[PDB]
């Protein structure tokens, strides 16, 4: 518990170093600021365009000309500025659909990663998901996905079953493994070798049926209780 607590505390500590040292990390939220600022800067700059009128400025047309020709020059600015707005609103509708797809994903990671624990691989970060913490950010959310990553492999010889009194034994939970001379049953995601027993294993059939079954004793805990 102290190792796991200190690894968690240290990994939460590294998040501030990571976000402080990496300007590209927030780049997904900063690009949402940049695209919408650039869309308005492009919309505003299009008021400087002539679109084929005698001026880009509507008050030049209205102060120089009179209705027979002024309304012809104005309708070139109306046509161009209306096409400039229709372009912007079309881009903002497509951009809003992308932000909504991201908000639906963020709402799904809130339910499944934060309010739960996720069995979905790589949904709540790389590793076997433990839990996630939401942090707010400008235009977004940030999830600190806590995950168990296995870290220090050992190679073991392994078997699908053990054959005892002709009975084939399989592990209830875990794997059979050997250190090279002795056979143990271990849980799969962390090495914790236990003696092979009638409590750790279940029988089905006999040695004839299973390819790669190994002959080993299986301890029956009732035996010394009857013999004592």
């Amino acid at each position: 518990q102290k190792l796991i607590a200190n690894q968690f505390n240290s990994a939460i500590g590294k998040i501030q170093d990571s976000l402080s040292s990496t300007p590209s990390a927030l780049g997904k939220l900063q690009d949402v600021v940049n695209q919408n600022a650039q869309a308005l800067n492009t919309l505003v700059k299009q008021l400087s365009s002539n679109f084929g009128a005698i001026s880009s400025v509507l008050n030049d047309i209205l102060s120089r000309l009179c209705p027979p020709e002024a309304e012809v020059q104005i309708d070139r600015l109306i046509t161009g500025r209306l096409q400039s707005l229709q372009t912007y609103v079309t881009q903002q509708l497509i951009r809003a659909a992308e932000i909504r797809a991201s908000a639906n994903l963020a709402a799904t990671k809130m339910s499944e990663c934060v309010l739960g624990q996720s069995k979905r691989v790589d949904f709540c970060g790389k590793g076997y998901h433990l839990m996630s913490f939401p942090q707010s950010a400008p235009h977004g959310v940030v999830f600190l996905h806590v995950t168990y990553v296995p870290a220090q492999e050992k190679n073991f010889t392994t078997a699908p079953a053990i054959c005892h009194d002709g009975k084939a034994h399989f592990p209830r939970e875990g794997v059979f493994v050997s250190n090279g001379t002795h056979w143990f049953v271990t849980q799969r995601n962390f090495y914790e070798p236990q003696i092979i027993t009638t409590d750790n294993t279940f029988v089905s059939g006999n040695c004839d049926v299973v390819i790669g079954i190994v002959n080993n004793t299986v301890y029956d805990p009732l035996q010394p209780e009857l013999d004592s």
Binding site: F143, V149, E153
Partner: protein, 73 residues
């Protein structure tokens, strides 16, 4: 310093026989980066470190320890 990529002719970048993670993406498996005496280099991108898993019909690797990772999304 003049190099034919399948994206087009690349000029002013030093072609390199090594491969690295893609820094600036040029196309058709080619990338470029600025590196050491410094030049823009151009290279075929590396997809990852090559690994062989030590598979056999009776060998299993079981992890004896863990790390509590925290990945920011």
């Amino acid at each position: 310093n003049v190099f034919q990529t399948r994206a087009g002719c690349l000029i002013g970048a030093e072609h390199v026989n090594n491969s690295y993670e893609c820094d600036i993406p040029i196309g058709a498996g080619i990338c470029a980066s600025y590196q050491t005496s410094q030049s823009i280099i151009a290279y075929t991108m590396s997809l990852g470190a090559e690994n062989s898993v030590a598979y056999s019909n009776n060998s299993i690797a079981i992890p004896t320890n863990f790390t509590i990772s925290v990945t920011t999304e």
